[PDB]
Amino acid sequence: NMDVIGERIKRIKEEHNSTWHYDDENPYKTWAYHGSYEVKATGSASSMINGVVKLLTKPWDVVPMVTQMAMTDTTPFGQQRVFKEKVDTRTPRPLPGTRKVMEITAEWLWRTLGRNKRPRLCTREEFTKKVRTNAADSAKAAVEDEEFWKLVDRERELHKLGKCGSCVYNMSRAIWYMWLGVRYLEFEALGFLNEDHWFSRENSYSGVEGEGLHKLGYILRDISKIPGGAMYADDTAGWDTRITEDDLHNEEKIIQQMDPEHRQLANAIFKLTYQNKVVKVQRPTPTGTVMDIISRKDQRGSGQVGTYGLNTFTNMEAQLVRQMEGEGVLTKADLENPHLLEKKITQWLETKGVERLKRMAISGDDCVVKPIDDRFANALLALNDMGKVRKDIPQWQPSKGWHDWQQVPFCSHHFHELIMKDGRKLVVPCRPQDELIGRARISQGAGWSLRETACLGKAYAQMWSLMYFHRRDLRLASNAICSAVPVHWVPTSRTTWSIHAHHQWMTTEDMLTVWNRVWIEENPWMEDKTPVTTWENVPYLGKREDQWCGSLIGLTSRATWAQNIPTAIQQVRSLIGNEEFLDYM
Numbered sequence: 001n002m003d004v005i006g007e008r009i010k011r012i013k014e015e016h017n018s019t020w021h022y023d024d025e026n027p028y029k030t031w032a033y034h035g036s037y038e039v040k041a042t043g044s045a046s047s048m049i050n051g052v053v054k055l056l057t058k059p060w061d062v063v064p065m066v067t068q069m070a071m072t073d074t075t076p077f078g079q080q081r082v083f084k085e086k087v088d089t090r091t092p093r094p095l096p097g098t099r100k101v102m103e104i105t106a107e108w109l110w111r112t113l114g115r116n117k118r119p120r121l122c123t124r125e126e127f128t129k130k131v132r133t134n135a136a137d138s139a140k141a142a143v144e145d146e147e148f149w150k151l152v153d154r155e156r157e158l159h160k161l162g163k164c165g166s167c168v169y170n171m172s173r174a175i176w177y178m179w180l181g182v183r184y185l186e187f188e189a190l191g192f193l194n195e196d197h198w199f200s201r202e203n204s205y206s207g208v209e210g211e212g213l214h215k216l217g218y219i220l221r222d223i224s225k226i227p228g229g230a231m232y233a234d235d236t237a238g239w240d241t242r243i244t245e246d247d248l249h250n251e252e253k254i255i256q257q258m259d260p261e262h263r264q265l266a267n268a269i270f271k272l273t274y275q276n277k278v279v280k281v282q283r284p285t286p287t288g289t290v291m292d293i294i295s296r297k298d299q300r301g302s303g304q305v306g307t308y309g310l311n312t313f314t315n316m317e318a319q320l321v322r323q324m325e326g327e328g329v330l331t332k333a334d335l336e337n338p339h340l341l342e343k344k345i346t347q348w349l350e351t352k353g354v355e356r357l358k359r360m361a362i363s364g365d366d367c368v369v370k371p372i373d374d375r376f377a378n379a380l381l382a383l384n385d386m387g388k389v390r391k392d393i394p395q396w397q398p399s400k401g402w403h404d405w406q407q408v409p410f411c412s413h414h415f416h417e418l419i420m421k422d423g424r425k426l427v428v429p430c431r432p433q434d435e436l437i438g439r440a441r442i443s444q445g446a447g448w449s450l451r452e453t454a455c456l457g458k459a460y461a462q463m464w465s466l467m468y469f470h471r472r473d474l475r476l477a478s479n480a481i482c483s484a485v486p487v488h489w490v491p492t493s494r495t496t497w498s499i500h501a502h503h504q505w506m507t508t509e510d511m512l513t514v515w516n517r518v519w520i521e522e523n524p525w526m527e528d529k530t531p532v533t534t535w536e537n538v539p540y541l542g543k544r545e546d547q548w549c550g551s552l553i554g555l556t557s558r559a560t561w562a563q564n565i566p567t568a569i570q571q572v573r574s575l576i577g578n579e580e581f582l583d584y585m
């Protein structure tokens with residue numbers, strides 16, 4: 001293993017030779033531990049509270065989920081505890097027959113995904129534009145420095161030689177440029193998967209990349225129209241830890257469709273940074289805090305460019321395999337067989353594969369499958385054997401599916417069909433309300449002015465106006481936040497890093513105009529393009545559904561807050577000062 005990773009550790013060892021030591025009482029069991037060096041204190045045991053959102057959501061000061069979110073441990077102590085849980089494990093190797101099916105399915109899937117698109121290298125300019133648009137700090141400074149790009153060139157030259165010297169994944173500018181440079185090289189070689197939308201629904205059939213949260217429910221309702229069994233949405237326990245060396249070698253097959261110069265750089269990313277990896281992990285000690293240098297040959301690096309797409313790929317593959325087993329194409333004897341006949345697997349893929357892909361909605365480790373019947377519920381041999389063991393259920397207990405797409409969990413949400421006063425239907429995203437309120441009450445980091453705090457609060461409010469307007473308490477709180485924050489103040493900072501967030505709320509444009517554009521004009525499931533002229537015509541969930549999904553409507557504390565919200569708004573206004581405000585109540 002040292003032939004591939006040695007140079008990287010050598011550069012860390014040499015850079016930190018002042019404090020480099022081998023801590024013989026390190027906690028690593030399944031990862032190779034190489035050494036440690038002293039560092040400063042990074043992360044916090046608690047998160048800063050957004051005073052603007054908190055002041056305007058008084059009834060939720062007494063809500064347990066809201067309090068839990070106000071915590072989240074990011075210190076070296078919190079980093080170590082989550083590591084032991086799933087990260088520090090080994091996945092048993094799949095059986096030979098299982099490995100054969102995965103190989104036939106991966107080959108077929110990559111050809112299918114590349115039927116119209118050709119892989120290509122991503123550029124310094126694309127990465128720069130991406131860094132810039134997402135920064136509006138030290139990443140934008142690095143991108144504007146010519147010396148960073150000269151380091152990129154030097155690392156690339158090693159990659160072309162099949163060597164790596166600085167590509168280290170993490171759990172002043174010297175080590176920082178090595179990290180961003182590692183991400184740029186990864187982006188250069190594998191970025192086409194995201195940039196050229198290989199996992200869009202049109203390209204992948206099962207994929208939802210670029211669709212947006214506002215389209216996922218409609219996609220689930222369309223899947224519900226396909227004849228078959230129940231809709232299954234099984235959660236895998238720590239998906240990234242279950243990515244095997246066999247999965248990595250199947251994912252690598254995309255390089256076969258690349259141009260020689262691209263193939264060379266993607267192969268270096270696959271072989272030196274995915275199939276071999278050097279990781280930095282913070283750890284507290286009685287002496288203080290150290291940074292551990294560890295390595296392994298399998299699993300997925302969660303904070304990588306290709307992670308989403310390669311997880312989507314491997315999950316589409318794993319679900320097709322489960323679908324085959326449910327249909328009796330794959331038996332127990334087939335999975336143990338090192339001489340498994342390809343014919344019936346190839347025939348099923350060529351005749352049914354695309355139709356079987358359309359029965360799914362797959363976003364990384366998140367999947368929804370509507371099989372041809374319910375034999376799938378008990379088709380667990382290949383799923384467990386591939387290492388994709390379901391969370392919190394005995395390995396061999398049949399999966400429980402749903403007969404109503406509206407009950408199906410997907411991407412931390414469920415989706416409701418609403419009837420508007422004019423008879424038109426909307427399919428909206430929803431989640432337990434405490435999770436939405438709890439998230440909005442948190443400000444990222446510290447040292448943020450009231451101005452910056454109010455603008456993030458405004459971002460949360462406008463996200464609720466656009467995605468969660470159907471929740472009575474969220475429309476009320478949203479109107480209260482937007483009434484309390486100056487009209488011309490632009491929402492700054494993101495409400496989420498979700499791949500499904502299109503951030504249509506990151507504006508000073510009128511929210512009802514934005515609502516109309518998203519839900520009416522640009523909505524392909526809205527045949528009638530008549531604009532909604534008032535929020536009075538923007539529907540709510542049925543009162544009972546709003547309550548089942550966490551609404552405090554019907555409670556006294558809620559009626560008191562609603563009646564007295566102009567007072568709290570006026571308090572936020574007086575602390576912000578003499579600015580232009582609009583009353584949305």
Ligand SMILES: O=C(O)Cc1ccc(O)c(-c2ccccc2)c1
Nearest residue numbers: 213411412467496498499500501
């Ligand atoms: O990415 C995921 O798996 C789910 C997820 C999580 C958090 C979110 O804030 C959102 C989200 C909210 C509003 C608009 C778009 C996306 C989605």
Ligand SMILES: [Zn+2]
Nearest residue numbers: 164165166167
């Ligand atoms: Zn490298």
Ligand SMILES: [Zn+2]
Nearest residue numbers: 414430431549
């Ligand atoms: Zn709901």
